[PDB]
Amino acid sequence: PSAEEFQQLRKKYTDAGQGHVFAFVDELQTGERSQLFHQLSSFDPVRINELADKALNPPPASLEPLPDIATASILDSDPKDLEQWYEEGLKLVAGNKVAVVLMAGGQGTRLGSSAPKGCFDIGLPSHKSLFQIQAERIAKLQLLAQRISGKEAVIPWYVMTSGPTRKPTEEFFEQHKYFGLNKSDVIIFEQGVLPCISNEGKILMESKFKVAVAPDGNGGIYQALLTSGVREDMRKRGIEHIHTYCVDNCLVKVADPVFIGFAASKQVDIATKVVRKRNATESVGLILQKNGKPDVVEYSEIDKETAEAKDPKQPDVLKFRAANIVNHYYSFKFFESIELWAHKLPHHVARKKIPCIKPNGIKLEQFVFDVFPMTPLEKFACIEVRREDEFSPLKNARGTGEDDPDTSKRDIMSQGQRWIEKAGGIVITEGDVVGVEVSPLISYGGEGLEFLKGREIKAPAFIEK
Numbered sequence: 112p113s114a115e116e117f118q119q120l121r122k123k124y125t126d127a128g129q130g131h132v133f134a135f136v137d138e139l140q141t142g143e144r145s146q147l148f149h150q151l152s153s154f155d156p157v158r159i160n161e162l163a164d165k166a167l168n169p170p171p172a173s174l175e176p177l178p179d180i181a182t183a184s185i186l187d188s189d190p191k192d193l194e195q196w197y198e199e200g201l202k203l204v205a206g207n208k209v210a211v212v213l214m215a216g217g218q219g220t221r222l223g224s225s226a227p228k229g230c231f232d233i234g235l236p237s238h239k240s241l242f243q244i245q246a247e248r249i250a251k252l253q254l255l256a257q258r259i260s261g262k263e264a265v266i267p268w269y270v271m272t273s274g275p276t277r278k279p280t281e282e283f284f285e286q287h288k289y290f291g292l293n294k295s296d297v298i299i300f301e302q303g304v305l306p307c308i309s310n311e312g313k314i315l316m317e318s319k320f321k322v323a324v325a326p327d328g329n330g331g332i333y334q335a336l337l338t339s340g341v342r343e344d345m346r347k348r349g350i351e352h353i354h355t356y357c358v359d360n361c362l363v364k365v366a367d368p369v370f371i372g373f374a375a376s377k378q379v380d381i382a383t384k385v386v387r388k389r390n391a392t393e394s395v396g397l398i399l400q401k402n403g404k405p406d407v408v409e410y411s412e413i414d415k416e417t418a419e420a421k422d423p424k425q426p427d428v429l430k431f432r433a434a435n436i437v438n439h440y441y442s443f444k445f446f447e448s449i450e451l452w453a454h455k456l457p458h459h460v461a462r463k464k465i466p467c468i469k470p471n472g473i474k475l476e477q478f479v480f481d482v483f484p485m486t487p488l489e490k491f492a493c494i495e496v497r498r499e500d501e502f503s504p505l506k507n508a509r510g511t512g513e514d515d516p517d518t519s520k521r522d523i524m525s526q527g528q529r530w531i532e533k534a535g536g537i538v539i540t541e542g543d544v545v546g547v548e549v550s551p552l553i554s555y556g557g558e559g560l561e562f563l564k565g566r567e568i569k570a571p572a573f574i575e576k
Contacts (some may be wrong), residue, residue, distance in 0.1 A: 112148040120151055125371055127156035128313070133296055135319035135468070143320035148304035150322055154306060156314070162305070162475055163312030163411060168457045174408065174417055175400045176431060177493050179424075183373055183496040186387070187425075196237065196376060202366030203375060205256040205264045210350040211249070211366050212336075214437075214479075215358035216273040216302045217244075222508050222516070225274040229358040230283050231505060233516040235523065235548050236573035240284065241505065243357055246297075247551035248365040255555060266366045267348060268292070269341050270299045302331040302341035305458075306468045307465050308473045315467040323467050329357070329437070330477025333446075333453045344448050353441040355479075360436065360520040362503040362526065365555065370440055373494050379423035380445035381405075381483060382492040384438040386502050388429055391418040395434035398493055404484035406437045407490040433493060436502045437479070440492075455480045500526060501555075524548055524571070531568060534560035540570040552576040 121133050132151060135412055147440035166501065176182075177551070185193065203209050239247075249266050256264035272280045281299055283374040284290070289297050305312040307323040317523040327334075332355070336342045345353070352375060354366050364370070367384075374382035394410040400410050405548065420430040458475040465472030483491065496502070503522035507515035524546025528538045531547055534557075538547055547568055553576050554560050 113143060117144075117148055120148060124151065127160060129156045129159070129291045132314050132316065132322060135316075137206075139320050147320040147322075154314075154322075159306060159314065160312065161309070163308050163473075164459050164471070166460050166475055167310075167312060169457075170410070172401050172408070173403070174413070174431070175403075176422075176433070177398065177400060177405065177491070178459060178488065181377075181405075181488065181492045182433075182495070183492070185369070185497050186495065188406055191382070193287060196369045196372030198368075198372070199376060199418050200370065200372030201256055201259060203371050204252060204266060204366060204368060205260040205262070205351065207265050208351045209266050209366050209371055210345055210348070210353045211266055211268050212332065212341075212355040213245070213268060213270045213358055214280075214329050214332065214355060216271050216331070217275065217276075217330065217357070217359070219276070221506065227272070227280045227283065227358075228505065231278070231516070233505065233519045233523075234359060236571055237548055237550065238574065240283075241361055242425075243287060243290050244361070244551060245363065245365055246292055246359070248363070248555060250291055251553075251555040252366055252368070255558070264341075265293070265296055265348075267296045267298060267345075267350070270297065271302055271332060272299060272419060273302060273334060274324065275303050298341065298344065300335065300341055301557050302335035303327045303338070305475050307467070307469070308475070310473065312473075315465055315472050317467060319426055319468055323465055323472070325474040325476075328476025330456050330458070330481055332479060333449045333482065334455070334477075336446060337449060337453075342449070345443060345446065351443045353443065353446065354439070355441065357504075359505045360438070360502055361505055362522055363438070364501055370438075370494060370496075374440040374442075374492055377492045377502040378442075378490075379440070379492045380442050381486050381492040382440040382494065383483075384436055384501065385433040385493060385495045386436055386498040387495060388432040388434045391429060393434070397431050398433040398435050398480075398483075400488070401484065403488075405486055405488060405493075406484045407480040433495065435480075436496075436504075439479070452482065452485055455485065521546065527574070528570065530557040530560055531563055531574070533557065534563055536560065536563035536566060537567045538570050539567055544571045546570055548573045550575040 116369050215229045230240045232238050253264040304324040305327050315323040356363050396407050396409050398407050422428045422430045456477045461474045462470040503519045504514045505519050527547040527549035
């Protein structure tokens, strides 16, 4: 950067009310001066002002459960419906019509690690990361699909990272040889980032030569699909169904055929998974009709009477019970519409402790569910699944005793032991350490374990291919 092109950037920033980002330029080495110049060149400060202004200077709801027509349930639907959804979703996989978008754009440090979350080792006997478990679920499902087609089935895995995790994520998959998946079918890409801002919308500085940034929220996924070329790559593959979820769910059923089959059967644009809210006081966001439109409402917005209300058609159960687990389905037609509305997704203010050179700051974030109320009711569906098979988020460092490595480890290992018992394996537990880790290359969802009938397994153990 010449003194001059530099001065132009400074003018742009200064005319935009963000000139303070150059306040320390005098005390910088030239390498540091370049890095600053290049990073500042990648944001439009006028764009930042507009988003900061909307978020800071912005412009009682009726709640009802989604229509019965739009909901199904692993626990409550007819098992014939469930079996048919399963077979139908597997046929879609075998057709090469199913893609996964993994939201791994997040922080991974809450755990004592500055590696991507997905690399985290929960202390399973196998020591596998989240990434590897998930890749193995993909590989086994592809194989399950191959005993239909008699042909290779491919579920491409579009792994959305942010700026900070992109290179460590690439290198992790590299070292693990893509966990036995074809390199062409694992596509790591980036969502956008934004500068973090003060309470007055001024860009925050991480260091004297570097702006503090954050990813633009999990709602940044829609725009990231276009910028990255991901959507057009799906187009070229003839993908028609897209499963999305967050990498922190250690139990995620990747590309779950039931979910795909259910949604495809209703011809929806978006579907969603939930788990059962069992007690009125649990603090979970719910998927429901807010103002006659599909939406997710934070628990703070659910008053006591609504929280406690029982389902009239099913009185043993809560009327509002669809606990959101950030686990979605989309049609490809839906992804083709992204240009028409991605500008309508608002940036929400997350107030945060952001360290910076002189809560104090804001991260601006689009929400993945903000497109739901823009979706016609009849183009939206929701399925309720069993938590103990489907949802175990890794959010806290050890010793918290909630959504942490130990809860995740026990959820997977108790699942392994259940599956083995249902197949007539005898799991013997001699001491506290409970459960058995079943490699997904052996069983995706509990199938394929007949071979264990009668055998005695000492818990803890690891059952691998």
